[PDB]
Ligand binder design. Structure first.
Ligand SMILES: *[C@@H]1O[C@H](CO)[C@@H](O[C@@H]2O[C@H](CO)[C@@H](O[C@@H]3O[C@H](CO)[C@@H](O)[C@H](O)[C@@H]3O)[C@H](O)[C@H]2NC(C)=O)[C@H](O)[C@H]1NC(C)=O
Ligand SMILES: *[C@@H]1O[C@H](CO)[C@@H](O[C@@H]2O[C@H](CO)[C@@H](O)[C@H](O)[C@H]2NC(C)=O)[C@H](O)[C@H]1NC(C)=O
Ligand SMILES: *[C@@H]1O[C@H](CO)[C@@H](O[C@@H]2O[C@H](CO)[C@@H](O)[C@H](O)[C@H]2NC(C)=O)[C@H](O)[C@H]1NC(C)=O
Ligand SMILES: *[C@@H]1O[C@H](CO)[C@@H](O[C@@H]2O[C@H](CO)[C@@H](O)[C@H](O)[C@H]2NC(C)=O)[C@H](O)[C@H]1NC(C)=O
Ligand SMILES: *[C@@H]1O[C@H](CO)[C@@H](O[C@@H]2O[C@H](CO)[C@@H](O)[C@H](O)[C@H]2NC(C)=O)[C@H](O)[C@H]1NC(C)=O
Ligand SMILES: *[C@@H]1O[C@H](CO)[C@@H](O)[C@H](O)[C@H]1NC(C)=O
Ligand SMILES: *[C@@H]1O[C@H](CO)[C@@H](O)[C@H](O)[C@H]1NC(C)=O
Ligand SMILES: *[C@@H]1O[C@H](CO)[C@@H](O)[C@H](O)[C@H]1NC(C)=O
Ligand SMILES: *[C@@H]1O[C@H](CO)[C@@H](O)[C@H](O)[C@H]1NC(C)=O
Lengths: 491, 491, 491
């Protein structure tokens, strides 16, 4: 009963987590959290974004009005989902700069179509084809009007349609490419047709292409599709002496967050802000390894499959040399704090957590967690990142831009976790050392550092005395004479 | 009079500045500096870059030689400033790949035009139009030569111009699309014209299409503009049976720092390396939030409106636990240093700054300031970043490249400031602790740490004695007997 | 002989290395390593990548089968090396979108050519030209078939070639533009020809343009080159009434790591994963300043010519204030450790390295080295980064993408080295301090800190005694009474 021992320590856990730091690729901490989202349910949630399942309809075919796509008339979407099983079943066509028209319509997010009163004098309208059947009957794109000769004449068509509204109009039209010179003359009379579609400030002027091509649904001819945007106060003009596949009206254009995605994932009734072709994913983590293609408020795509952020101190079953240093060992029985005191005196032994030092470490770790885990990434219509055809220069560049981006963000994520982990380990070591130093300072000349995180207190120090040290009210003067006598033999 | 007190401390100010760190979203430091430039004067400075105000002339119209644009003949610029009020007033035209021609001329930075001795046998030159008046007279683009029939014949033109120089020549030429067959035959005799412009390494052939486009300044036809660059030792060949709008010569091409910007900001007499469409901005800060479009030595565009870099210690009106730790409190009355000493002795009280510790903290902070705010970003001709029309694929990519860039730099700036501030707080805490420890070591057995940054010195220690401690010359041996006697009663 | 001195210290070297940190642009460390590769041997190593030296053949000429390029028939490569001296020696031609065809063939990595059963009824095959000699005899591109009239007739050609395989076929074909009407008629009978090449999903119709171009190898006519990819289950059709330069079969298409590089560096026998136009470079460093154009597992291109990473402590011939702090001075005579002890006792003087602290510092530094210099960057076919012609919009974007990437990586590299160096200086300072503190703790009341990294041990401490302190088994209880006496005169 003439001396007491007061030992400082920190908690420990039976199963820790291995994390990476600046100096160690593998080091065990008490707790960590995963920063990379690597799983999806495999389904696209239908809220909060308006999802339109294209089913067997490509957006381009829903736009032109392929007969199997009539149910998509006037549809809207935040995200149009294009299925790989979708196919075209109308007159065979191509779209110079297909990707751009698909993109601009996808971004517009509506197929709202307004029929206009184009006057086509002196021609036969509403041409139909065995390539574009409605049941057994010949048919054609709903939004296009295939004009041919009337009697022995195809006149010079010259028509206008002013835009007197306050929104932009999108016109989609085509040019028919016959298989032979004979077909050219049979349909259009003139041996060389031409289609010129213009506004006051722009024009597209096209000549038909003649030649036999592989039969598609019985047809060797083809249509090429073009588009024209007409702004308020501007006007559409169409001038043709043959081969014109006319528009029936315009699509309203909108701006907003709409886009299109290629996916075969089923749609489900649930809520998720982030969508990938693999399905919706949670956005609670800052990074994800599910797909570079995303839509909505999403974690950033990185190459890593896991990045673990330490959320507790080193686990011992640092710059300051306290944790895993002069303190040999963590305490598994300390579950109400991160740091604390054990003591041994006349009245027995005991353990108490230190609230203030525990809270300081927790507050600092929560601070970095809040910084890191803060959702900051919301992107909608972007660039394409997977490609079905070889194209060369433009595709090389699109791929390189995305690859460059991913490599830079993977770098940021890797560094972030290594630096943060090194600092977490160092600040928790720091808090342990600061509590030790504060205790040392309280004790003045009445105790000695045993070298293992323990003080030998050279006087009788009962439970209330120990509590005075723990709560920062120890009065060293009260015990000094006793202590100096015991330490040094002074009186 | 037999003991003294020596206290260590650091300065503080009544009102500090809130900054962000890795672990704290809000923490008060003594001083900080702003890293984001958020303001402009609203004017473009006319030095040091050569600014050319386009006024009511688009670069394309100054190039072709629209009659309202004669003052721009042979102009040069580092930055051509294009105003939104600019309009065209000549024959209605379009430029396939308009953006590319505008870009390459802008980047070249000169409209220096060299008239060449082209021979046009058998045609009428200098065609003119009511759409392009010069005063009361019909006129045409100054740099183009509208060729028409002579008598009842328009011959096959076949002309050459070798490049015997050692620089590239830019030729700008056009093809006329008449409104009607009557106009075509009246001008060119041939029912269908053709233009082929070739060199040894390239060829461009355009077959115009006849048809009405909207009436513009009385004209329903259009001219389409094309260009050809002829390398040293190569040869221009022009071949046409009608519809050629011929060049009169070539434009000189240069490489350098020239570009073009769309802005409605007025030009002013002043100096500024950095120009934005909003006006010039200072470049003393590393980041800016004014505009992603810039020219010259500019701060990097980021999303943040403010980023405060700590340039002083924590303000108390750290890893080491001195500042805001065992030192309870900063000293507002300490104004000639950052760290220092106060004492109470036989002669009274006093205060003195510690120069070495003050200077060490200041040098380290100036070090990071020099590193951070060092101007290292100078960009001239870049890509466009705002767009007046919907285009689809290439524009999607241009937008994505820029958004990607901005998000990465915004990340770098945010991390930089958080890391630097955390480190600044820690290094200033460190310097305080090191000064305390140095003082403790000098005192040996002659003093005890009171636990609050103060030492009780256990001997008579007058002003000279205190100064010996402050200046690092204290001789502990001189006072050891006296001190040990007071502490322990040894005598 | 009643006391001993034990001094702690660290090594130093006479000439250290100057590095940069967060706080100092220049600070000397004992050792550093260069992170930027700035040199090449100037030769391209022929392993492990399959390098194909194009010699005087551009890939495009090797593809078409220019007579000087016959040795490249059916070649394959990982990297095609294109020389600046390469020239074309066949009929003059141009390739609309040349860069894309060059890119896609380069990326495919093979010229494997399969002859197919095209039947050309009623025409003369194997046309040849004096512009395209094989020795003294006229010749033509080996992979193309120049068809001309047979007798007095050139009939409408109409042929098909199904893709019944499970791979993609690349067809390369051409259209002849005669110089004169006389030539057109002599070769093809029809006054105006036409070439239509199609599949089920695509079509191209090219109309030849008759007219003079500048003479190249005796020819004022030109051939234009086009290509068509035919997927499994699709069908190629070719339909023409003149001017067709027919394919003889297809090139097999592959995907993989192949690319093309412009370089004049010789190829030699050696091994190198990374190739630049300057020659191969080692990939042991994470960064390089040799060339932005690279192929293989390469360091990342940065703007800096040098970046030195500290791999040793501060050199003295920190946050903790030990190194270049209370320890005045490093020890050059310490060659078997980074930290250690010198002593002075009755038996003389001595020195010993401390293994554990030395190893702790080394292990931490090796940890960051392994992290930093870990080869993680491997790129194959990318985008072009140097250009011979002005092009405008697409080239502006390619350049901007590459410049953006480089500035971001240069930033990352600069920050990495500054941060790592600051931390290395601090952790080595920490390790010195930790050793000092551990020693202090062992000695208890038996020694005093002299303030300069040395302990005065206040008792007889022979060689065995010193060694017990160095190996951590010192028993302070044995000497405590003797020590307190010398210290205060208490025993
Ligand atoms: C100065 O610092 C450099 C960089 O750390 C030291 O060079 C490094 O030395 C180590 C040990 O010799 C090398 O590690 C070894 O690498 C080989 C692979 O070749 C491996 O088989 C060994 O088991 C060991 O891992 C390391 O490669 C080498 N690095 C470089 C860039 O040379 C150098 O030793 C230091 N000098 C002094 C005097 O401390
Ligand atoms: C281990 O670390 C995780 C990460 O912080 C802790 O989980 C957090 O707990 C707090 C408090 O309940 C919640 O507010 C957060 O939402 C949780 N975050 C996550 C990502 O789940 C967890 O509590 C820690 N475990 C222990 C035993 O401390
Ligand atoms: C040009 O060649 C094609 C291919 O041989 C011919 O098209 C075939 O015609 C038959 C009946 O007319 C169809 O059953 C085949 O399916 C067609 N094949 C393809 C690939 O389309 C075409 O008739 C020929 N044209 C001329 C004018 O002879
Ligand atoms: C083709 O149609 C356009 C549009 O109706 C005609 O252009 C109009 O012509 C009248 C008479 O000159 C003008 O008053 C209008 O301003 C014109 N409108 C536009 C939009 O240009 C054009 O004349 C017709 N062309 C032919 C050959 O009949
Ligand atoms: C068009 O003009 C060019 C230039 O004079 C002619 O090409 C030259 O023809 C002569 C002999 O006919 C050659 O010796 C020259 O080398 C050619 N020059 C070039 C640059 O090719 C061309 O023949 C003319 N074409 C017509 C149809 O008259
Ligand atoms: C997502 O789909 C892609 C292919 O579309 C696949 O490579 C990837 O492994 C998938 N990820 C998950 C988590 O299923
Ligand atoms: C605050 O920091 C800035 C940046 O170094 C400096 O210019 C200014 O003088 C500082 N103010 C004080 C009072 O130190
Ligand atoms: C600069 O101009 C843009 C308009 O493009 C505007 O959005 C921004 O608020 C302006 N900033 C300042 C500081 O004037
Ligand atoms: C590599 O080549 C480039 C381009 O030719 C040149 O600018 C650079 O100086 C070269 N570098 C070395 C190290 O040879």
């Amino acid at each position: 009963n003439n001396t007491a021992t007061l030992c400082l320590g920190h908690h420990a856990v039976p199963n820790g987590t291995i994390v990476k730091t600046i100096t160690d690729d593998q080091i065990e901490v008490t707790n960590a959290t995963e920063l990379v989202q690597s799983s999806s349910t495999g389904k696209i949630c239908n809220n909060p974004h308006r999802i339109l399942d294209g089913r067997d309809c490509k957006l381009m075919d829903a736009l032109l009005g392929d007969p199997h796509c009539d149910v998509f008339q006037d549809e809207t979407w935040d995200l149009y989902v294009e299925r790989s099983s979708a196919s075209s079943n109308c007159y065979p066509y191509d779209v110079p700069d297909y990707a751009s028209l698909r993109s601009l319509v996808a971004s517009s997010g509506t197929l709202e179509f307004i029929t206009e009163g184009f006057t086509w004098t002196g021609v036969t309208q509403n041409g139909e084809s065995g390539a574009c059947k409605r049941g057994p009957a010949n048919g054609f794109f709903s939004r296009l009007n295939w004009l041919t000769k009337s009697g022995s004449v195809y006149p010079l068509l010259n028509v206008t349609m002013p835009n007197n509204d306050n929104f932009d109009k999108l016109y989609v039209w085509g040019v028919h490419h016959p298989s032979t010179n004979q077909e050219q003359t049979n349909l259009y009379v003139q041996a060389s047709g031409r289609v010129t579609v213009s506004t006051r400030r722009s024009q597209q002027t096209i000549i038909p292409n003649i030649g036999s091509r592989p039969l598609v649904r019985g047809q060797s001819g083809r249509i090429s599709i073009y588009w024209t945007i007409v702004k308020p106060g501007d006007i559409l003009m169409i001038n043709s002496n043959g081969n014109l596949v006319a528009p029936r009206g315009y699509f309203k254009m909108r701006t907003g967050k709409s886009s299109i995605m290629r996916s075969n994932a089923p749609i489900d009734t649930c809520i998720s802000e982030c969508i990938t072709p693999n399905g919706s994913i949670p956005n609670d983590k800052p990074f994800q390894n599910v797909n570079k293609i995303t839509y909505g408020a999403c974690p950033k795509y990185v190459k890593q499959s896991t990045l673990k952020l330490a959320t507790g101190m080193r686990n011992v079953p640092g710059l300051f040399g306290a944790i895993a240093g002069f303190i040999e060992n963590g305490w598994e029985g300390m579950i109400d704090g991160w740091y604390g005191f054990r003591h041994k005196n006349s009245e027995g032994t005991g353990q108490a957590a230190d609230l203030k030092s525990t809270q300081a470490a927790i507050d600092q770790i929560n601070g970095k967690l809040n910084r890191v885990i803060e959702k900051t990434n919301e992107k909608f219509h972007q660039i394409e990142k997977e490609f079905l055809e070889v194209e060369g220069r433009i595709q090389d560049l699109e791929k390189y831009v995305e690859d460059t981006k991913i490599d830079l963000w993977s770098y940021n994520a890797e560094l972030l976790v290594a630096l943060e982990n090194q600092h977490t380990i160092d600040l928790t070591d720091s808090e342990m050392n600061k509590l030790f130093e504060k205790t040392r300072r309280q004790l003045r000349e009445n105790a000695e550092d045993m070298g293992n995180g323990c003080f030998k207190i050279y006087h009788k120090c009962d439970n209330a005395c120990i509590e005075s040290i723990r709560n920062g009210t120890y009065d060293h003067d009260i015990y000094r004479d006793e202590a100096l006598n015991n330490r040094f033999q002074i009186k």
